[PDB]
Design a protein around this ligand. Structure first.
Ligand SMILES: CC(C)(O)[C@H]1[C@H]2CC[C@H]2CN1c1ncnc2[nH]ccc12
Length: 167
C-alpha cells in the first residue's frame, strides 16, 4: 500500500492520473520523482522547468555542479540527484528529442532507467517539447518498465485520450 491517491490502474505495474507532477510530488513526497531532463540538465521548461521552479532553482544549482563534474548525460541515460522539497530523490532521465532528430528507439533505453527504482512518480518521456507522441510513450513505458510507475499527465484531454486508445 502506498499513498498515491486517485490513480487509474492500467496494468499490473502502471498507474495513471490527471495531475501536475509537481503537485503529486508535493502531496506524496515520493521516494523518486522522475524529471524529463535534457543532456545538459538545463531545466528550462515543461516538466523540468516546473520541477525546478518549484525547488526555487535549487535543482538547477545542484545540476550545474553535476555537469561541471561529470559532463553531459547520454540520451537514454539518467542520474540520481536530490528531490529537494518534492521527493527524496529526483531521477533525471533523458528521452530522445524528436525535434533534434534523436532516435526514438532510445526511448526504450530511457524507460529502462525506471527499473532501478521500486516505485516512481513520473511523466511520460519524450512527450511535450521533446516531440514524440505521448500515446507511443505510454506504450513503450508499459512494455519496458517492470517496477511500479505512477504517471502524472497534466492535460485532461490527453489523459482521457491515452486511456481510450491504449492497447
Ligand atoms: C502533459 C504532459 C505530457 O504530461 C507534459 C508535457 C506536455 C508539455 C509537458 C509538461 N507536461 C507535464 N506533465 C506533468 N506534470 C506537469 N507539470 C508541469 C508540466 C507538466
Amino acid at each position: 500500500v502506498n499513498s498515491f491517491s486517485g490513480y487509474l490502474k492500467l496494468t499490473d505495474n502502471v498507474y495513471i492520473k490527471n495531475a501536475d507532477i509537481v503537485e503529486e510530488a508535493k502531496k506524496v513526497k515520493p521516494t523518486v520523482v522522475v524529471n524529463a531532463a535534457n543532456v545538459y540538465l538545463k531545466h528550462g521548461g515543461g516538466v523540468a522547468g516546473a520541477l525546478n521552479k518549484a525547488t526555487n532553482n535549487a535543482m538547477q544549482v545542484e545540476s550545474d555542479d553535476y555537469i561541471a563534474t561529470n559532463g553531459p548525460l547520454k540520451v537514454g541515460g539518467s542520474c540520481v540527484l536530490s528531490g529537494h522539497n518534492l521527493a527524496k530523490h529526483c531521477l533525471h532521465v533523458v528521452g530522445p528529442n524528436v525535434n533534434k532528430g534523436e532516435d526514438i528507439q532510445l526511448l526504450k533505453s530511457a524507460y529502462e532507467n525506471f527499473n532501478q527504482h521500486e516505485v516512481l512518480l513520473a511523466p511520460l518521456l519524450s512527450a511535450g517539447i521533446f516531440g514524440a507522441d505521448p500515446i507511443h510513450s505510454l506504450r513503450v513505458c508499459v512494455d519496458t518498465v517492470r517496477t511500479n510507475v505512477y504517471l502524472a499527465v497534466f492535460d485532461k484531454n490527453l489523459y482521457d485520450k491515452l486511456v481510450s486508445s491504449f492497447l
